[PDB]
Amino acid sequence: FVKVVKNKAYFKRYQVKFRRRREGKTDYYARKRLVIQDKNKYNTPKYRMIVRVTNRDIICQIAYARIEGDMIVCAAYAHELPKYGVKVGLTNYAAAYCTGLLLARRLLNRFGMDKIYEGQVEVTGDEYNVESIDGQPGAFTCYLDAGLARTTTGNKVFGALKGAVDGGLSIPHSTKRFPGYDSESKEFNAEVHRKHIMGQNVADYMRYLMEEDEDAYKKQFSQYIKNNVTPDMMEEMYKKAHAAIRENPVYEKKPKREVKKKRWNRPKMSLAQKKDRVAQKKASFLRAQERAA
Amino acid sequence: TNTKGKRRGTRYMFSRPFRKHGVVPLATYMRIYKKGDIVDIKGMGTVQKGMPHKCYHGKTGRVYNVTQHAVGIVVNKQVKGKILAKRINVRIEHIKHSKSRDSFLKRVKENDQKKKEAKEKGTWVQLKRQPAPPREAHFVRTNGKEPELLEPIPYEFMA
Amino acid sequence: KENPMRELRIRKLCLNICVGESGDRLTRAAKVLEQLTGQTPVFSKARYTVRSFGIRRNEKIAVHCTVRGAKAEEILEKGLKVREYELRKNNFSDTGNFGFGIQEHIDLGIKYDPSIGIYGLDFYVVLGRPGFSIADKKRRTGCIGAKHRISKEEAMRWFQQKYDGIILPG
């Protein structure tokens, strides 16, 4: 045989990692460099933009770290976009730009800074950075918390970044991870970036599946056909969406209805029950043994 | 004679506690330190930058200067029949807020509370702490039972 | 009433040719994996030096290549055709995978040429299941659980109902 590794001794010496690390959600190496503030700042919050793209949604939050836990000043989710006209495709790059733009304008509107710091209303895709206006409240500033996402060129977390800076957030960044930075020649053409922002890269893919195979097209886009969003009206849909966001970024929570107060989960068994089951298991094991005897 | 190495004899002093190695909990970093804060020093081996010298591990001082990552502390070090209030720059990880001063700060509140209170009532309420006094005279009830007898048990060779 | 997400699939098919020596003897064995699979193979160098085998540290001595999708499935159908669809019970690993070695590559049907030669390569099928991508995805990595694992026998019986292969003891 072979010696057992996971024995009594193994667990006596085992030191678990942090809960968020055992679950695989937080990189505490990068978090230590992100959240903590210089000691000569004294409770000056260090805001950071949290972008987490999931399978069916895009979550953009802005938080600053406190001792008891991060505090979210405002958040914008992708599942709100149907209000502003973006019916389907709530996780593509063009949707990420909207969620970032929504988060920006929603934050500024809670600071009375929406009139100032408009940003880029006419989206171009170039290297834009808002600078503070003298005599006015300083422009808001945060940093991007990519999390565990591999940050290569064209990652959707940078789409929300572009949406935020065009909304009026002073986020330090470089125009190198945007979709449009040609790697072998080291330049950036804002035009192709403007394509991904207005969702043109997927529009042609619907057009590509037009003459190639329509049945496979119906299989790759079903709710696009269900919501009647053809590649024709996609670019204007986002422009209508952006304008609808900048004019009403306020969020109205859903009305909270009182619920019947039931329990779907299984309550934890008590000691008396746990201790009595053993008496039944042993007794039944005997009263089944003399039946064989 | 011994060597004069900086980390000499700190095999256990700077070691991490059992099953407490690994990354540093971030609450230590997000902890503010004003000037004049009473602070106790405790070197942590996980972070080798800005460690205090071993003659300050366990000592308590007060902050006088705050930089980006570290603080300046004024600690009393006894050097052959004279005390020296000397300044050290230690990085935050080796630092805790001293809870020795707070129990005084807490006691100041009730003193300032029970002074403005019971002033208009006139009742003179004791403020100074007093040592544990000799306990009062009381009655011990033996209702029912009578005190059971104790007698030394006999010896019997254990081994 | 089985679950549709429990159907046992093929994750990957790993093919290597250990020439155990650098030089042209290996770069020729490089191109047999080329025109068989259709993708450029990768070399693997020796971990340390052993005098008896004649290999040295960091010396390029082998070449391997992994195949996924239906390209993997048809090569496995080609390889088992050389093995008359029969294996042994020891060929299957207790982790759910199995493998087998062939003696010459031209047995697969690919055309020989004197400029290359003949090489015996190695097969190893890695059976899978919808959901094994969890244990190697970056973000929320995690194990698979006992029920979802592939035992030895349910891998062998899979080989039964798939290719009608017989498994002889020995």
Next chain:
Amino acid sequence: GRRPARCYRYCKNKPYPKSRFCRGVPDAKIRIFDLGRKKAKVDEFPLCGHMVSDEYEQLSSEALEAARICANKYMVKSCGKDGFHIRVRLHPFHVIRINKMLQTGMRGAFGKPQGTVARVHIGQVIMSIRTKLQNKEHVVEALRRAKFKFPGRQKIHISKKWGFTKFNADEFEDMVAEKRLIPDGCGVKYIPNRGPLDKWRALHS
């Protein structure tokens, strides 16, 4: 040969075991710590006699080896060859040093390893013997003959435990009836009520 045992009797130095730093130590003279019918179960040797120390001193490895033989010899004549089981419960781990001469005097006088010795405490069992309770007066004479090979004074005590186990002879037999104790070769395994219930099934059936 070697110095008298007066030179090394008192626990003078810190324990100095044979280790990475103290290498080159000659082997101890005692190598066998169990003898007799050591391949015997727990139900045939109830009686257990001790030789308890009464001094915080050092017992040489040669005295341990000599006392093992003298106690072995007497039991063989008395209780036959297989009617007992002797267990020396002191292992010599402390290494003593000697600053042998051949002049240098005390310059650089850190000795070389001479021999090995066992640090015994007060009330610590030196040697134990289990046998049939019939042969009671036979072990007290075997241990009485073994004291003369040892410096200091020792007491001979007949334990209330059952054999070499840690359970009293008054409670041993029953604790086997309700199966708190399962005979495991020379000793016994205590079985609590804490394991998984499936192990309880394996015993009660």
Next chain:
RNA sequence: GUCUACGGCCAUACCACCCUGAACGCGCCCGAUCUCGUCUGAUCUCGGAAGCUAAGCAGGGUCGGGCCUGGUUAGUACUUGGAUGGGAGACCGCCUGGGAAUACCGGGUGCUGUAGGCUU
């Protein structure tokens, strides 16, 4: 009640196995035109929504291991101060105060902040 995003404490949260998961969600999953990256679209990146809770995840279970917290061990071991105390010594007792650790035997099995859902 419960989940998601980001957390604080970092096993009462781990590990093994088993059971059950409404709704939302998280996932698995479907693809490779574009972005990006691989020997391989497996990972990574990107575009999706046919299928599924099988797995992850959540909850519960185990006379479970571990861990946490007690009892016991035990006023024991050790120890501050004291004696013209004992003993040939080794060492020990007392006075004055302080006071442990296994084995063995119990109980416990994550709390919680901000923001947003679902059970309308």
Next chain:
RNA sequence: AAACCUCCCGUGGAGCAGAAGGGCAAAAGCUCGCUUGAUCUUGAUUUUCAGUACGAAUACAGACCGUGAAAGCGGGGCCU
């Protein structure tokens, strides 16, 4: 028995130039990419200490840079 390929277990039982100790697991290890903070310049402080030097080191500040999407990190070697 050891060449290479694959899966599984694996709290570090490896590695980090060297003695030993400490420290370290999406790293401080290994592999790549780009680099020269191993640069220029004031003071303060720590260590040995007489509280003198040298050496070594820690916090800053002013420059010039590197790297990274960025927060940052870096004025030699994880620390002694």
Next chain:
RNA sequence: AUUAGAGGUCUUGGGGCCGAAACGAUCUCAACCUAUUCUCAAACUUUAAAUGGGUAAGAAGCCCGGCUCGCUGGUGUGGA
């Protein structure tokens, strides 16, 4: 570092025994593994004292109000 028996399996090996032979059996003997068991560590340690080392026990303290800043900045923000 170290004593002893138990229960395991060919996980392998040592003379074999009926086996041409066969993890098939056979008694084995060993290592190996799982539970226990005896004995220890100045250069080992999960635990862990007594004695001991810091600091605090106010007027240089608390509590309001207002100015200054080129520092710090969603924000007469933060700090001084």
